[PDB]
Write a protein that binds this ligand. Structure first.
Ligand SMILES: Cc1cc(CCCCCOc2ccc(C3=NCCO3)cc2)on1
Ligand SMILES: Cc1cc(CCCCCOc2ccc(C3=NCCO3)cc2)on1
Lengths: 273, 255, 40, 236, 273, 59, 59, 57, 40, 40
């Protein structure tokens, strides 16, 4: 492939460099339209800018935490982090978010990796070996109430059991209801006067719930869960302007008030170098 | 003697002529078309009013003055009240449509000024409150009036800050969306053909707007000496290939 | 070799090697030739 | 039972590896795809669309005005604007090009810089745009500027001028984050003759300026952007 | 292959052993040009002197250390070794360095092995199990500031998570900007009067950053990281004189003052055996 | 699931072993090679060039 | 001995995965199947039989 | 596979929607027996409702 | 590839792709045609 | 068998078995024959 062809002096009536940008086109002008060039080859394919590659590496999408401790006398397991859940979503952590929102609709399979590490902040004789049981709880399924409810039987709901310190990995097909996931949605769930506006209405994909299977030892053990997400088989439509201001909320476009100028001011003139 | 410059668009029972055009943009290089069976889901036969809905509606005019910040209309909202297009809209459960948008602004060879005319698929607005305040329905359904970016923040309304496109992105990059400029010195109209863009084959026309049309002054209007300091901008829009499905009782929407 | 039955379980996809910027860079209705005048 | 040996790296999680995994939802059938206009395949497809450069960066809070390069009637010989070419920083940084370049470590290729004139139709002007390849200072006067890559632009019916910064380089890749060894030059613009307004007209006229990449362009070695960060996880 | 051919008495006008070294050549003289030889075969190929073999074994290129401890009240994580980094470079440890600098330009893929072991120098009830997360931070990427910054999300930057006591291994293609890496560079980054001289200007490849993912236990744990590097697919040009004096700095050729004579003095005469 | 048995040596790191590894930079394209005079392939090539001997070591 | 590398997820138990296992009862012979009317293959077969709706829910 | 065929106005002596449930059958009535439909395809096989799948986790 | 000798040890079965609701939805002795009168 | 997609991930290269010391041992412009006089 040639990156530049050889081109010499020109004295024409045919001027490729004068255009009318009002038309909305970006005319494909090249170095050889306005200087004299020599042949050179590309030596490159643009492999690593493919959208599959761009969205295809694992990104941290969520960090939560649960603890193993005596539940005796706990009136609210959920509240003691005896188990915890996560209202699945991919917009909470914002590094991966800016990348996805370069597109309007996106379609992909997900590969999740879940790393779990334990901490024992206060005096323990040892490190126990805990098994985590993260289970997927889709919309309209008995949400779990204690850390050892019938829910955890999970007879119809996919669940994975792995050890703290290890990693769990599995992959979920594209579960969207439509043909693509909306990265943006300028609508409502119905024409009410006070119903929420955004995608949050849209992208209610149910939540994920984690717990330790082990009963309690004499000390307490903090287990912190990190969920990583990798898109595989990516398809993206309609590019948009990149995010400039900071994010404030999952699912709304809102930016913070009295934010700071995002364009760097010159130290000098327009004329400055 | 054909120029890129003169054009005629006849759609239904209405025709537009421009003698000072700058080509026309067809979003994503695709022209509006009906919904193919292979893509269909709802089993209902759809209704295609054709020429009674696919004609040109001219919205009320705006006034560009030296202080203007820009205006924003949503589709199909802007047309919610135009003739039979609008009736069909409130009466069917689902509908689908593409449009021809023609924005008009003429001046003289002594004026200067340049407007950006852009179509943004799925333009989800931001609340000026920050945090996770929502933007109430009425605020994102201004109707033919559209939203005036130089109007004041209101409560439950969107933010109207132009350098941020009403969503946290910079004005400068709106050029990645199908758009055309109106530069008084060149141009006097802008025309964009919009194919139907959605993640579902057909949708509700009232709970979801699928494009915002935005006209934004970028190089300020400058009139000749002792000229009146303003020009009107007119927007005429025509639904094209419209289909409605799931007819019934007639939606009632807030406000 | 796929070891698993479902398609979601396969590895990343392979390069589009599609690449056609004209839907984004030249969505004009009447074709513009480089070198010919923009507005006739 | 087949005998195996495990190597160093067993059990590691590399966020960039690409392997098979069991599906949690065996046998599930995804929604059919329908057609949607606009599919993107390569980031190289989109960085060829031009976007506006806030060249007039001299303000103090972001404003529509930093996109406008002003021009003065009747000045002769003088300089319209100047900038270095660190596409990952400074004026370029918020543009779509700048914004994507920042997802990669290295770039190579030609850039296309165009200027669209917005003055009254009955005015006229001749400007010179000059690209100064690495190795010399930003030009200080047109004489200096005109000895490097340049285009005399004659403002006419055809409203925009497209200047190309041809890839001039020893090393075949440069860093997107500004680096010296790897630096690309300067871009300046001067009156060639001068802007002239018709009667009954007055004041400043402005140029809009865009940037996009030539088909020439290469970007490689993905990394994280300095353009976005956060202090606590967001919630709904 | 014959190592020596058979050759007998000679009384010629053709003298292969008289040459003129002023020419710059090393004339290919053999035993059989000056004594009577018998046939012998080589029995050898020179396999283990191939440059791929010479540069192809893992060498320790870096030892760093980080600790897991309560960051509460630490004003400078980097400074507490709450995480640490490394300004990637291959010239810091000097065994592998002398080997590479036998050549001027070198091109190869790298295979890294990272061994991490833990130490608990002061009273602990136990040994905790820590997961390390070494992540590559290339030039112009948000450098990380705390041990748990948004940076560590590493949504676009390759990162590996492995356990202390284990090893991590992965391989990075030749990332040089030119066609080869310069082992030497007699230049500057530009013609300034005070800019640094060497390769240090050249070979600024960005840094690598390590941290423990675990929160803190009651005791403190020292984790010491050793990075090993193996060249694979080696290509080397222009041999040079081997390094004689000791090294003083990464990237400069400088040797220490009042160094010692590097040539061993005879214990005796020139005539001595 | 195929039945396996691991042998002695599993998990060891031998600095001299030669195996495959995942690339950290999937899909990256290295700079083209250009021609450079002087390529060395074997150390046996270079030890045939003669160099001076500090024979007079007595200093 | 063939060189291997284990990936993330090793040792996990996913209640939805489908693999082979050793039989605890090697060589056992199950009872023959006889014919029984009524075999169901898909839940989609049965949701097409209509059943009564307690529409008058007001009790 | 078609999920619905195209069907238009009807004015017949052949009424598929009147039945006698006392018989014990569930007559296979479709949308196209009582409204005007357009063609649409199934795009689906009913894989995940197989009893092997239902009892197999 | 089965690694084991017994049939119980193989993975899950594969979709019936049988599907015939008529034993449940139309177990009537004399065949009913849709469109013809239910009771003659 | 390569298990990985990228070339960097393959094992060590295989012996040049190239070997030609003359660029280093005899870079003279006019060819010298062993046995013939060095300087004529
Ligand atoms: C955009 C966008 C991204 C998302 C997330 C979609 C992923 C589908 C549901 O995700 C899961 C997560 C976990 C599990 C799980 N099963 C057993 C353990 O974890 C299954 C599906 O939604 N919209
Ligand atoms: C000579 C010479 C040698 C070098 C080093 C080059 C290696 C390229 C960059 O090295 C790395 C190191 C680590 C990682 C990494 N990714 C995830 C974890 O570690 C990636 C590239 O530079 N010049």
């Amino acid at each position: 492939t040639v990156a530049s062809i050889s081109s010499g002096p020109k004295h024409t009536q045919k001027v490729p460099i004068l255009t009318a940008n009002e038309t909305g086109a970006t005319m494909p002008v090249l170095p050889s339209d306005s200087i004299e060039t020599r042949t050179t080859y590309m030596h490159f394919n643009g492999s690593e800018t493919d959208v599959e590659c761009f969205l295809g590496r694992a990104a941290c999408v969520h960090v939560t935490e649960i603890q193993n401790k005596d539940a005796t006398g706990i009136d609210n397991h959920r509240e003691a982090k005896l188990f915890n859940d996560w209202k699945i979503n991919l917009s909470s952590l914002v590094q991966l978010r800016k990348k996805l929102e370069l597109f309007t609709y996106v379609r992909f399979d997900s590969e999740y990796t879940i790393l779990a590490t334990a901490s024992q902040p206060d005096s323990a004789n040892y490190s126990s070996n805990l098994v985590v049981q993260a289970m997927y709880v889709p919309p309209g399924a008995p949400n779990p109430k204690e850390w050892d409810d019938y829910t955890w039987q999970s007879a119809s709901n996919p669940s994975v059991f792995f050890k703290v310190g290890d990693t769990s990995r599995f992959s979920v097909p594209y579960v969207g209801l439509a043909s693509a996931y909306n990265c943006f949605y300028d609508g409502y769930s119905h024409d009410d006067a006070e119903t929420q506006y955004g995608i949050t209405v849209l992208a209610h994909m149910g939540s994920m719930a984690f717990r330790i299977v082990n009963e309690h030892d004499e000390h307490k053990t903090l287990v912190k869960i990190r969920v990583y997400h990798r898109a595989k088989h990516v398809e993206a439509w309609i590019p948009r302007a990149p995010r400039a201001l900071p994010y404030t909320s999952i699912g709304r476009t809102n930016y913070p008030k009295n934010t700071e100028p995002v364009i760097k001011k010159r130290k000098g003139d327009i004329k400055s170098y | 003697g054909y120029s890129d410059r003169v054009q005629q668009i006849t759609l239904g029972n209405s025709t537009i002529t421009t003698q000072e055009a700058a080509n026309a943009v067809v979003c994503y290089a695709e022209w509006p078309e009906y919904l193919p069976d292979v893509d269909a889901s709802d089993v209902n036969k759809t209704s295609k009013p054709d020429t009674s809905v696919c004609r040109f509606y001219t919205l009320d005019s705006k006034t560009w003055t030296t202080g203007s910040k820009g205006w924003c209309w949503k589709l199909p909202d802007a047309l919610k009240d135009m003739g039979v297009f609008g009736q069909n809209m409130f009466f069917h459960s689902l509908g689908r449509s593409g449009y021809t948008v023609h924005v008009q602004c003429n001046a003289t060879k002594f004026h200067s000024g340049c407007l950006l005319v852009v179509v943004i698929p799925e333009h989800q607005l931001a609340s000026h409150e920050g945090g996770n305040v929502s933007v109430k329905y009425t605020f994102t359904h201004p109707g033919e009036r559209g939203i005036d970016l130089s109007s004041a923040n209101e409560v439950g309304g969107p933010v109207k800050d132009v350098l941020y496109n009403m969503n946290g992105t910079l004005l400068g990059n709106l050029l990645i969306f199908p758009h055309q400029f109106i530069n008084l010195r060149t141009n006097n109209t802008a025309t964009i053909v919009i194919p139907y863009i959605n993640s579902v084959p057909i949708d509700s026309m009232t709970r979801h707007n699928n494009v915002s049309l935005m006209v934004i002054p970028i190089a300020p209007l400058t009139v000749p000496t002792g000229a009146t300091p303003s020009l009107p901008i007119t927007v005429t829009i025509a639904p094209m290939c419209t289909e409605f499905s799931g007819i019934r009782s007639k939606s009632i929407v807030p406000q | 070799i796929n070891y698993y039955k479902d398609a979601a379980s396969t590895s990343s996809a392979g390069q589009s090697l599609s690449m056609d910027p004209s839907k984004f860079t030249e969505p004009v209705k009447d074709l513009m030739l480089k070198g010919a005048p923009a507005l006739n | 039972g087949l005998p195996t040996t495990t190597l160093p790296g067993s059990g590691q999680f590399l966020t960039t590896d690409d392997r098979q995994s069991p599906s949690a939802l065996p046998n599930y059938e995804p929604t059919p795809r329908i057609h949607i206009p606009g599919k993107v395949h390569n980031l190289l497809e989109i960085i060829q669309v031009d976007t506006l450069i806030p060249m007039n960066n001299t303000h103090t809070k972001d404003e529509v005005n930093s996109y406008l390069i002003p021009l003065n009637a009747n000045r002769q010989n003088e300089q319209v604007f100047g900038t270095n070419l660190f596409i990952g920083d400074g004026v370029f940084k918020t543009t779509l090009l700048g914004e994507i370049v920042q997802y990669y470590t290295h770039w190579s290729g030609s850039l296309r810089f165009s200027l669209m004139y917005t003055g009254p139709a009955l005015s006229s002007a001749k400007l010179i745009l000059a690209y100064t390849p690495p190795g010399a200072r930003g030009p200080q006067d047109r004489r200096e500027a005109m000895l490097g890559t340049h285009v005399v632009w004659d403002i006419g019916l055809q409203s925009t001028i497209v200047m190309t910064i041809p890839w001039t380089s020893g090393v075949q890749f440069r860093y997107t984050d500004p680096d010296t060894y790897t630096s690309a030059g300067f871009l300046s613009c001067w009156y060639q003759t001068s802007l002239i307004l018709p009667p009954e007209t007055t004041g400043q006229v402005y140029l809009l300026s865009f940037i996009s990449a030539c088909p020439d362009f290469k970007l490689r070695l993905m990394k994280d952007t300095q353009t976005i960060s956060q202090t606590v996880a967001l919630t709904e």
